[PDB]
Swiss-Prot record, chains A, F, G:
Domain of life from the UniProt record: Eukaryota
Domain notes: The catalytic domain is sufficient for recruitment to lamellipodia but catalytic activity is not necessary.
Organism per entry: Homo sapiens
Residue span(s) of domain DED: 2-80, 100-177
Its biological purpose: Thiol protease that plays a key role in programmed cell death by acting as a molecular switch for apoptosis, necroptosis and pyroptosis, and is required to prevent tissue damage during embryonic development and adulthood. Initiator protease that induces extrinsic apoptosis by mediating cleavage and activation of effector caspases responsible for FAS/CD95-mediated and TNFRSF1A-induced cell death. Cleaves and activates effector caspases CASP3, CASP4, CASP6, CASP7, CASP9 and CASP10. Binding to the adapter molecule FADD recruits it to either receptor FAS/TNFRSF6 or TNFRSF1A.
Protein name listed in UniProt: Caspase-8
Family per record: Belongs to the peptidase C14A family.
Entire protein: shown range: 1 to 182 of 479
Post-translational modification: Generation of the p10 and p18 subunits requires association with the death-inducing signaling complex (DISC), whereas additional processing is likely due to the autocatalytic activity of the activated protease. GZMB and CASP10 can be involved in these processing events. (Microbial infection) ADP-riboxanation by C.violaceum CopC blocks CASP8 processing, preventing CASP8 activation and ability to mediate extrinsic apoptosis.
Propeptide: 1-182
Subcellular localization: Cytoplasm; Nucleus; Cell projection, Lamellipodium
Cystine pairings recorded for this chain: none
From Swiss-Prot, chain C:
Region (Interaction with CASP8), start-end ranges: 1-175
Lineage, top ranks: Eukaryota, Metazoa, Chordata, Craniata, Vertebrata
Organism in which the protein naturally occurs: Homo sapiens (Human)
All residue ranges annotated as the DED domain in the record: 1-73, 92-170
Protein name per the record: CASP8 and FADD-like apoptosis regulator subunit p43
Region of interest called Interaction with FADD, as start-end residue ranges on this chain: 1-175
Domain of life: Eukaryota
């Protein structure tokens, strides 16, 4: 049962924030009902196993997930995979099992500080109810809510661009790169 | 056989069983899964091509490959030819229910209480319970969905409204 | 009296004003304990004591007139006239307590809970509580009453604050 | 003595007061453990041990004078005189334990349970802790050496003073 | 002893205590599984293996010294002497299993369930133990699987306990 | 109950910063998932007891931990052990239960002021996003993050040398001493 | 609640420096864990009440502290106590609950200028890290840290004398007086 032991070791090195990010990045293959009570890496791994995206012979999805959160030490220690191999694998078209849209959203999310978050919340006061603008909400919560009310999606980006333009412009660079990639 | 049936009945989930009962309600309840499968084998058509589609409807590819020794290709071909077993109405209902949290169903049972008794709905119920209660009240059908669409719009879930519109356009 | 407007009002209010609203309607819903805003409003609707005038009065009390303007399209003048021409849903004692709670900072709650530490216990006051919570706890001991505000008067005088003492005396003279 | 009075009393109280009341009444109902406070009150009424004065005493133990003023239409002085006259159902030991539990914050009870983990084995409360200690036949209204020693060790001397004063009263 | 004695015992026991008692007497309930704890006690009494000494042994095993003092008026020394002298009703295997179950937490037991779902394929630890016994994967002579599982979850104190017990029994 | 009382007394004499230092120093024997919900020394001692690295008859690891954080008064009071005994014991090979690399990291971290911290964060803008370069972070958090992204392993130190060369050079002396130890 | 009101009045007049001095003076009566979150006089009074060292019957401790911190106006206003009474009480053996070690340390701390503090820090920068030797740090923090590293204590005072002899002798005179007292 070494596979289960390896999975447990991998899961034991995750805090709350990494678990939240992983949960967010799996919205494309996990329904909200199956995701509401998830509070540990083991439960998420079981959920992925239920859809047969994770097994001994199939580790690509886990590798991509761990790569996207930059936890390279976990990749190298247990999965015996280096950065170059993952970069080459993701460079190959058809190997991408996660939309670059979500990846771009997550990367943008990582580039906001608390003051920038407050400025973003203040800017989006007009179009969003204060109930969804709770001070406890993070960027990912706002993104999930906006996607829920279909005010922001794959083709709906103009409000996002306008709001993000105030804080920074490299965000516009990332958005333009993603658009050109499509 | 019988061992495969025992594994199937023991490897499922209570909410999964509830979803299965809700889906099989369309064909036309047995509290246990085993009795329902016996009924399907006896009166209905307990074909492999049908059970595979039924399990694929609930995203259980692990049991699909483990037990049937078949991948998603067979069920994909079966769906492409014809979805004999289930209806797209039930499929859309289950898909909508799969995308709601506790707050969503709480708001739904609060709002729909306008013309439903408090004891009729009771509490601690899933979206399938709301759907079957509305069916008993006889105002929700695969052709009449305007009231449901409006109620959904009220709780600010417009992506699901677009999904409803897309389903209505398809059929 | 739809539940739709009820949900709209509930979502449009922060948690800060939720507790104030629960405190303001404590007397009317006194035979039962209300857990949150939605359940309290449901109880009022079931009891039949909830109407559009009651909701407008409560919104005026919490001072969210813009919500009435956007939803009910009603200004503060109309609700003020309605309150003048109709019995008050909320006692002046309750609104006085709420205004006092609003008119203070966290720099004073520590001093106040220290002053009345004899009556209460360490565990009860260990967690952070608002002024209205302390008022409710004092009421549970029957030490503060709408017709009996002497202890609160003394405590307010003890913190070198007298404008609130003048407000309390004004309410007493209003009796 | 109406059952509706009982229901009103149950409605007025919250979960914490219910827990404290259950702990207080645990001793008399040693034969039957009531999972619910309503069941406890019904049992007391059936046994006849619940009366107007008994209810007033029980409510006063929880420090809820609003109900007495409103429902029972009584003050603290009349019930105090009655208790000075009528024998009390609860022992001074139980109320002392409740008072001690009132003055301990959730931080230090963790320290106490960490100290006492040697003699036993999760959101524990002080009342639950003393119930567990009673179940293991370690803390009794007679002997209180363990609690006094542990309280002294954690730099809580006022509770030691209270326990000593109670002991000198006996 | 009498019917009222066992009735009081059933009344005073807790659901977790009843479950642990049912698990513990599984070895002596080999002939038939009793659906009820009181049914099990009646069967044991009618089987002749149940006596005052046996009842005290069970109560000590479930750590209910308060009932023994209140009901049977006995001390821990008496039951210790009875255990030392009279033959032990149940194997220390069950005692060790129960003690281990007293320490594992909900997160811990869930992690263990995820670990051991590989060989198999809400449930408590004791339920997992009885499942493993049903599959005949663990026996009072074989513990290497359980030892390895406990080692993998970084709970080494239980491994030390198990090794010490295995040394003691042989 | 003298042992537990002594442990409680020891725990009563530590601030938040000492607790953070201990949590950082015990990362090898404690995974992150258990590390996160710890806000007092008592829970940490419970975990160590669970792993049987500390008991009534075994106190070596606790003594090592207390000495490594430069807290000798507790050692002489509640353990009756001075600096000489601990140093002599540490002289014994195989008794250094803490890898010297962690000790070196802690020592380096202990010799940086606020201005030096700001300079370090400004200099680490090369391969690290500014989100981890916010002023909230401390040096130990920077080490943890760098260790996560396999840029500061036990054998990977040149980046650390390059960044530290911009503030002080005695740090290079410390690193050279550590290397000479290996 | 007159007594509590008087206590609050007494605590009102205290400032940040007075609060810090009081926090230092109660080291043997308040361990670090309780000491750290203290940021007002009221919390300190509550903690003192916990150990039954301040109440209606016994008020000697508060008078002793106020006399030590040289707040005579507060003593004569809110306590109806004179300096002569305090001196008479302190003359009686066993009445003082503050170690003369701490008293003389505080007295030395009160007799240091900024230049003298800088000279002390420069003289004792060899054995102490610069982070604890920050300019904002006063003499009390340095003394606390020195007590932590068992380099300064009742049985060891030579280092203190050697450092203090570089500026003034009257401080060494007070040290000699304390030595001869015990």
């Amino acid at each position: 049962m070494d596979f289960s032991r390896n999975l447990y070791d991998i899961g034991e090195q995750l805090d709350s924030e990494d678990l939240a990010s992983l949960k967010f990045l799996s919205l494309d293959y996990i329904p909200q009902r199956k995701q509401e009570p998830i509070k540990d890496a083991l439960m998420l791994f079981q959920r992925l196993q239920e859809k047969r995206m994770l097994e001994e012979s199939n580790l690509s999805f886990l590798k991509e997930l761990l790569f996207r959160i930059n936890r390279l030490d976990l990749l190298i220690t247990y999965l015996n995979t280096r950065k170059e191999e993952m970069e080459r694998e993701l460079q190959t078209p058809g190997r991408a099992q996660i939309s670059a849209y979500r990846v771009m959203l997550y990367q943008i999310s990582e580039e906001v500080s608390r003051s920038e978050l407050r400025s973003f919340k203040g800017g989006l006061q007009e179009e969003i109810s204060k109930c969804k603008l709770d001070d406890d909400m993070n960027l990912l919560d706002i993104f999930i809510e906006m996607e829920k009310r279909v005010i922001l999606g794959e083709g709906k980006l103009d409000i996002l661009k306008r709001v993000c333009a105030q804080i920074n412009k490299s965000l516009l660079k990332i958005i333009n790169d993603y658009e050109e990639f499509s | 056989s019988a061992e495969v049936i025992h594994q199937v009945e023991e490897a499922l989930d209570t909410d999964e069983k509830e979803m299965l009962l809700f889906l099989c309600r369309d064909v036309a309840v047995p509290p246990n899964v085993r009795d329902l499968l016996d009924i399907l084998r006896e009166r209905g058509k307990l074909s492999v091509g049908d059970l595979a589609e039924l399990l694929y409807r609930v995203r259980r590819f692990d049991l699909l490959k483990r037990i049937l020794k078949m991948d998603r290709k067979a069920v994909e071909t079966h769906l492409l030819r014809n979805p004999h077993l289930v209806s797209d109405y039930r499929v859309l209902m289950a898909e909508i229910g799969e995308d709601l949290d506790k707050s969503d169903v709480s708001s739904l049972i609060f709002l729909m209480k306008d013309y439903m008794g408090r004891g009729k709905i009771s509490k601690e119920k899933s979206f399938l319970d709301l759907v079957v209660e509305l069916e008993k009240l006889n105002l929700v059908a695969p052709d009449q969905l305007d009231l449901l669409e409006k109620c959904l719009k009220n709780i600010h879930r417009i992506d699901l409204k677009t999904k409803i519109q897309k389903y209505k356009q398809s059929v």
